[PDB]
Amino acid sequence: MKLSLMVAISKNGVIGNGPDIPWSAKGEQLLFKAITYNQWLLVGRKTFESMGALPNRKYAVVTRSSFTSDNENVLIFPSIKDALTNLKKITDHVIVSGGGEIYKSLIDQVDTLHISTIDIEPEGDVYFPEIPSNFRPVFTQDFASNINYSYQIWQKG
Amino acid sequence: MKLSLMVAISKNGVIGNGPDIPWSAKGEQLLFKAITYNQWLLVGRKTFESMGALPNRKYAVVTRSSFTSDNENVLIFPSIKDALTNLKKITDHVIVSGGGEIYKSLIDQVDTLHISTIDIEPEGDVYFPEIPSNFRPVFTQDFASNINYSYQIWQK
Ligand SMILES: COc1cc(Cc2cnc(N)nc2N)cc(OC)c1OC
Ligand SMILES: COc1cc(Cc2cnc(N)nc2N)cc(OC)c1OC
């Protein structure tokens, strides 16, 4: 089972996924929409609830809180280990789509990073982890917008 | 100036960018939208007429047919060579976005390939070129849809 990771960060590494983040870049969220189309997303509870169950996405929500769903496209798992073991029987591909601690728990295990860097250095309390040494960038593209952004794909060797 | 190339093809290499393609995959066009946002696209006359001006794109149309657009985000050039030399002064990135003849002329000169392969074998006269051997795939992802499709990025 291939594991991807997708995140939007400021230049300083503040996580910019969230709903009412005021330094969002018009056009960047198109990348997230394109890459996650009919994909399994591994997310924590806060990420699921902020995002909602978007069309054409399937959700593995990891929480040991008493979270509940009646959406057949939303599975709940007490741990990452339990999520991964169970998705191995369901799909070939899972995209880790956030939570600070979700990303910190998993970044060493994933094969591919999809990183959007917004060209701003704002104040935040939740940072993306340092990219490990055994990842290398294999594609980069710049976008002019209200705030400029860069899209970069990394691969583990 | 980096040159990228973006296309949607069948599994037998038939070009499937067009407006009324029966074998178009739900979702795949999201990739084109995301990669082309506030980019310069290099296209032929036909591709530009079919596509019209989607907003938040700028267009370099190459044609020898003295084509006329009354449109803010379009520049007309007589050749590919003439287009690239003027764009070099205006932008650091152009995305070659179609005409089979456009793709044929430029594929050997571009740096990055964006290929969506739709899982089907229709008939058609306009094929995409064979991929020069100096290109390697650096990224693959598969999509289940009404017709399955694969997105692949190649680097020179
Ligand atoms: C599409 O809406 C959301 C998406 C995400 C996750 C996310 C968003 N953008 C990027 N580039 N990567 C991600 N993993 C997170 C969200 O809230 C925390 C969202 O709600 C606005
Ligand atoms: C978004 O609309 C169009 C886009 C294109 C070009 C194009 C379309 N899809 C992909 N994957 N790559 C491309 N270069 C070509 C078109 O018609 C010829 C379009 O009109 C529907």
DSSP string, A57-107: EEEEEE-SS------TTEEEESSHHHHHHHHTTT-SEEEEEE-HHHHHHHT
Report the alpha-carbon distance of residue B135 to residue B75 in Å, rounded: 30
Report the alpha-carbon distance of residue B33 to residue B38 in Å, rounded: 10
DSSP for B66-135? Answer: ------TTEEEESSHHHHHHHHTTT-SEEEEEE-HHHHHHHTTT-SEEEEEEES-----S-BPPPPPTT-
Report the alpha-carbon distance of residue B134 to residue B131 in Å, rounded: 8
DSSP single-letter state for residue A15: B
Edge-to-edge strands, sheet with A74-77: A74-77, A57-62, A39-44, A93-98, A2-10, A112-118, A149-156, A135-143
Report the alpha-carbon distance of residue B71 to residue B90 in Å, rounded: 18
**Residue A31, SS3?**
helix
**Residue A16, SS3?**
coil
Q: Quick one: CA dihedral B107, B108, B113, B118, positive or negative?
A: positive
Q: Do β-strands A149-156 and A112-118 pair in parallel, antiparallel, or remain unpaired?
A: antiparallel
Cα nearest neighbour of B3 on chain A? A141
Q: Which residues of B touch A92 (CB under 8 A)?
A: 142
| B136 and A138 Cβ atoms separated by less than 8 Å | no
| Residue owning tokens 């680097």 | B155
Ligand 2 centroid to Cα of residue B33, in Å, is 9
Report the alpha-carbon distance of residue B122 to residue B147 in Å, rounded: 12
Residues spanned by the domain of B27: 1-156
Using CB atoms within 10 A of its CB, is residue B8 exposed (0-12), middle (13-18) or buried (19+)?
buried
| A117 and A149 Cβ atoms separated by less than 8 Å | yes
To one decimal place, what's the resolution in Å?
Answer: 2.2
Q: Which residues of B touch A143 (CB under 8 A)?
A: 37-39
CB atoms within 10 A of CB A52: 11
DSSP single-letter state for residue B25: P
Residues ≥6 apart with Cβ < 8 Å to B108: B132
Q: Do β-strands B74-77 and B58-62 pair in parallel, antiparallel, or remain unpaired?
A: parallel
**Would you say the CB of residue B51 lies under 6 angstroms from ligand 2?**
yes
Atom 15 in ligand 1: which residue has the minimum CA distance? A17
Helix (H) or strand (E) holding B62: strand B58-62
Helix (H) or strand (E) holding B4: strand B2-10
Report the alpha-carbon distance of residue B34 to residue B87 in Å, rounded: 21
CB atoms within 10 A of CB B107: 19
Report the alpha-carbon distance of residue A127 to residue A89 in Å, rounded: 32
B93 shares contact with chain A (CB less than 8 Å): yes
CB atoms within 10 A of CB B55: 6
**Residue B17, SS3?**
coil
DSSP for A125-149? Answer: S-BPPPPPTTEEEEEEEEE-SSS-E
**Would you say the CB of residue B110 lies under 6 angstroms from ligand 2?**
no
Q: Which two tokens stand for residue A135?
A: 């990842």
A30/B33 Cβ within 8 A? yes
Angle at the Cα of A32 from the Cα atoms of B116 and B31, rounded to 5 degrees: 20
Ligand 1 centroid to Cα of residue A55, in Å, is 14
For residues B130-152, one letter each, b for 16 or more C-beta atoms within 10 angstroms of the residue's C-beta and e for the rest, the string is eeeeebeebbebbbbbeeebbbb
Q: How far is CA A42 from CA A4, A103, A157, B124, in A?
A: 10, 10, 23, 40
Of A67, A80, A149, the closest CA to residue A115 belongs to: A149
Total domains in chain A come to 1
Report the alpha-carbon distance of residue A125 to residue B102 in Å, rounded: 49
In degrees to the nearest 10, what's the CA dihedral of A100, A101, A102, A108? 100
Q: Which two tokens stand for residue B112?
A: 């990055």
